[PDB]
Design a protein around this ligand. Structure first.
Ligand SMILES: *[C@@H]1O[C@H](CO)[C@@H](O[C@@H]2O[C@H](CO)[C@@H](O)[C@H](O)[C@H]2NC(C)=O)[C@H](O)[C@H]1NC(C)=O
Ligand SMILES: *[C@@H]1O[C@H](CO)[C@@H](O[C@@H]2O[C@H](CO)[C@@H](O)[C@H](O)[C@H]2NC(C)=O)[C@H](O)[C@H]1NC(C)=O
Ligand SMILES: *[C@@H]1O[C@H](CO)[C@@H](O[C@@H]2O[C@H](CO)[C@@H](O)[C@H](O)[C@H]2NC(C)=O)[C@H](O)[C@H]1NC(C)=O
Ligand SMILES: *[C@@H]1O[C@H](CO)[C@@H](O[C@@H]2O[C@H](CO)[C@@H](O)[C@H](O)[C@H]2NC(C)=O)[C@H](O)[C@H]1NC(C)=O
Ligand SMILES: *[C@@H]1O[C@H](CO)[C@@H](O[C@@H]2O[C@H](CO)[C@@H](O)[C@H](O)[C@H]2NC(C)=O)[C@H](O)[C@H]1NC(C)=O
Ligand SMILES: *[C@@H]1O[C@H](CO)[C@@H](O[C@@H]2O[C@H](CO)[C@@H](O)[C@H](O)[C@H]2NC(C)=O)[C@H](O)[C@H]1NC(C)=O
Ligand SMILES: *[C@@H]1O[C@H](CO)[C@@H](O[C@@H]2O[C@H](CO)[C@@H](O)[C@H](O)[C@H]2NC(C)=O)[C@H](O)[C@H]1NC(C)=O
Ligand code: NAG
Lengths: 49, 171, 197, 133, 49, 37
């Protein structure tokens, strides 16, 4: 799963068989690292005109 | 595609253009019924003219509906209707309101604007003789109501001649 | 209490949200390419044939964007027409009284009040409606001393035995007098003349 | 069988009401077992027209009605290299040879965005001062 | 055959989109005309303008 | 603000819209139609 963004800590709970989540329109929202098994949070870093 | 599995499978990965097209077509189809409803449905009740016809000398026989015809349409409506003049995945839907209901709305409006005047456009229809409604209507354009009562027959004759000329020109 | 009374604004908001949502959703489409993600086809194929897939994805996304822009233009034109009508109503019905029929509410217009709304305006119209009618009897003019009399402003009525002059929109009889009637000619041409004093 | 096709699961009746679910060709359905019938235009009356009779009101009522009019929508702007390329050099290079397509899109979006604000301003700014009760 | 199928599909889709856009424009114009007609009926038939 | 879409705030905030509405209403209650001409 490749992509850019800023990684923060998240309190969302994953069932022990998922690996990542998404909210709507099939856009990644949160991912779990395969080593420490914790739920992170992905936010697109700021941009604008 | 036209009943082709391969074409449908190939098209399945082109997104959701077709849903948008169908939604737009459905919206513009509904808009026509909405337009007809808002233009014609202007009266809460369905008025009808009394059997005895004496409107101070005016003659409305050519615009009032004729019960003899099955369509219950007047002479001018028939003239207009006569004047105006296969399957590949496209269909034509019928209008919600048929011609008879539209004719009934027009007849109700025309019968309510004769007996009551403009009163039925605000509250309940209030009866009034036509020769006095016309006198009221002259009073609204700067001409005193004196003028009408001395020239009733001439005005009626001019109106009848004008409507006959309109009928002849349309025919 | 009653909901669903603000359908227009809710419909506008829903249409905008749905259009944006489907525009975002269009990213995941394949458009006949190998995959819907650029990085996979970049790291899986060298440029000489990967450029074909890149071109297919680019043209598909461009077409989707163009369609979205056209739809936005259509909706903008519609909203502009609606708001022009709203501005005309604000100018004509709030800053003064209106005479044109059914422009502002049902009945005879009295006045109006504006209120705001998240993406629009709400007009409250105060009007006037008559009720509790009667029948009476009517004549167009009255012949006295051989000359015809017409009402200045009002109409002749009779409660069966006596004649009165009233105003059109409210029942308030008054005794017939020279001060509210005018004379014109003799009672020989009008059809409906009645004898009285 | 109707003029617009045929209905299955609905029972025809001889009555007529101001219906709520349109079907077509005058026919329309309602719940009340689902039934289908012909819509009724309204109650029919005949005004007692004569040549020496009127109807003058004696009382009045005052009613307050409401109407709702939208005036503006959300102002949006869309980027291109972020959208159709997602920060990729190869995609940017390939897109560079399609002339200038995105300039027109940005121009149109900016035009409608300015139009929305002008529209709201012309709708609401009708006074020169600010009065107070 | 997929290349030919794709060519036919894209051509027909483009034609359909053009037709839909023309229909939208015509419907908007007809709606404006209908609004004008409704205003005329409300003002000139139900009263004196 | 997900992948290049931006929503621009309106020029007129709701407070000033409410102030316009209040000014119109207070003008029409007190003066009538004279304040529009
Ligand atoms: C996978 O990740 C590491 C790999 O070594 C291990 O997890 C931690 O490993 C460090 C050092 O190896 C220990 O000090 C920690 O106590 C370990 N934590 C846990 C929770 O085991 C382990 O092999 C794997 N960890 C998980 C969570 O699967
Ligand atoms: C109103 O006009 C109609 C149309 O001219 C009149 O109907 C005609 O009546 C004459 C005399 O009976 C007939 O010879 C014609 O054939 C009728 N024309 C039609 C088209 O039917 C009608 O008499 C007029 N009514 C009044 C009260 O004058
Ligand atoms: C029609 O109205 C007139 C005006 O009031 C009535 O005339 C008077 O009526 C009152 C009470 O009805 C009597 O006390 C007076 O003696 C009447 N005066 C005259 C000069 O008539 C009249 O009665 C009313 N007629 C009807 C049928 O209601
Ligand atoms: C109002 O209509 C009635 C009904 O037609 C007219 O009364 C008729 O008048 C004529 C002419 O005097 C008589 O020959 C009839 O016998 C009357 N009929 C009835 C039932 O009385 C009345 O003249 C009309 N009012 C007008 C024209 O001012
Ligand atoms: C209104 O009064 C006038 C004047 O009295 C009437 O005119 C004459 O009335 C007498 C008496 O009835 C008749 O002998 C004459 O023939 C009438 N002359 C004319 C030219 O009509 C008139 O008839 C009365 N009208 C009503 C409706 O009562
Ligand atoms: C006014 O007079 C009429 C008769 O000239 C009264 O009768 C009404 O007549 C109409 C049409 O024939 C019917 O639809 C009504 O049902 C009749 N009303 C009845 C029988 O009470 C009428 O009632 C009188 N009053 C009003 C307010 O119209
Ligand atoms: C006109 O209508 C109003 C409202 O229906 C009438 O006012 C009511 O009169 C009754 C009887 O006197 C009272 O019980 C109600 O409380 C009144 N309502 C209000 C809101 O004050 C009024 O009487 C009617 N006018 C006439 C002449 O009958
Ligand atoms: C009434 O309904 C019956 C069947 O329910 C039908 O045969 C008939 O034509 C309808 N109309 C009349 C006037 O009976």
């Amino acid at each position: 799963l490749t992509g850019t963004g800023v990684l923060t800590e998240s309190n969302k709970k994953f069932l022990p068989f998922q690996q990542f989540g998404r909210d709507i329109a099939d856009t990644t929202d949160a991912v779990r690292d395969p080593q420490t098994l914790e739920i992170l949070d992905i936010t697109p870093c700021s941009f604008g005109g | 595609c036209g009943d082709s599995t391969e074409c449908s499978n190939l098209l399945l990965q082109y997104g959701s253009f077709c849903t948008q097209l169908n939604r737009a077509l459905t919206g513009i189809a509904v808009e026509q019924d909405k337009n007809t409803q808002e233009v014609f449905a202007q009266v809460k009740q369905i008025y009808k003219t009394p059997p005895i016809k004496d409107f101070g000398g005016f003659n409305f026989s050519q615009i009032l509906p004729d019960p003899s015809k099955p369509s219950k349409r007047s002479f001018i409506e028939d003239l207009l209707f006569n004047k105006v003049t296969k399957f590949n995945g496209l269909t034509v839907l019928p209008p919600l309101l048929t011609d008879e209901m539209i004719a009934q709305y027009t007849s109700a409006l025309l019968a309510g604007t004769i007996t009551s005047g403009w009163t039925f456009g605000a509250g309940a229809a209030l009866q009034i003789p036509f020769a006095m409604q016309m006198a009221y209507r002259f009073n609204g354009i700067g001409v005193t109501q004196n003028v009408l009562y001395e020239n009733q027959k001439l005005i009626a004759n001019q109106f009848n001649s004008a409507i006959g000329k309109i009928q002849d020109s349309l025919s | 209490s009653t909901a669903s009374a603000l359908g227009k604004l809710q419909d506008v908001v829903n249409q905008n949200a749905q259009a944006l949502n489907t525009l975002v959703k269009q990213l995941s489409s394949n458009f006949g390419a190998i995959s819907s993600v650029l990085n996979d086809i970049l790291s899986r194929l060298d440029p000489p044939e990967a450029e074909v897939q890149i071109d297919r994805l680019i043209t598909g996304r461009l077409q989707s964007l163009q369609t979205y822009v056209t739809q936005q233009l259509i909706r903008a034109a519609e909203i502009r027409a609606s708001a022009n009508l709203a501005a005309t109503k604000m100018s004509e019905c709030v800053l003064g009284q209106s005479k044109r029929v059914d422009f502002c509410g049902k009945g005879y217009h009295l006045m109006s009040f504006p209120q705001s709304a998240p993406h629009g305006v709400v007009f409250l119209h105060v009007t006037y409606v008559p009720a509790q009618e009667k029948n009476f009897t009517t004549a167009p003019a009255i012949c006295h001393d051989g000359k015809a009399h017409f009402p200045r402003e009002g109409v002749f009525v009779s409660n069966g035995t006596h004649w009165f002059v009233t105003q059109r929109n409210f029942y308030e009889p008054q005794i017939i007098t020279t001060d509210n009637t005018f004379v014109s000619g003799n009672c020989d041409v009008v059809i409906g003349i009645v004898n009285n004093t | 069988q109707t003029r617009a096709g045929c209905l299955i699961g609905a029972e025809h009746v001889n009555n007529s009401y101001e219906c709520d679910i349109p079907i077509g060709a005058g026919i329309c359905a309602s719940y009340q077992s689902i039934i289908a019938y012909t819509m009724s235009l309204g109650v029919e009356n005949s005004v007692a027209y004569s040549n020496n009779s009127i109807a003058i009101p004696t009382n009045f009522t005052i009613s307050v009605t409401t109407e709702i009019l939208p005036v503006s929508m959300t102002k949006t702007s869309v980027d291109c290299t972020m959208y159709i390329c997602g920060d990729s050099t190869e995609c940017s290079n390939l897109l560079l040879q399609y002339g200038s397509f995105c300039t027109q899109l940005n121009r149109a979006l900016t035009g409608i965005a300015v139009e929305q604000d002008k529209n709201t301003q012309e709708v609401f700014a009708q006074v020169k001062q600010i009065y107070k009760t």
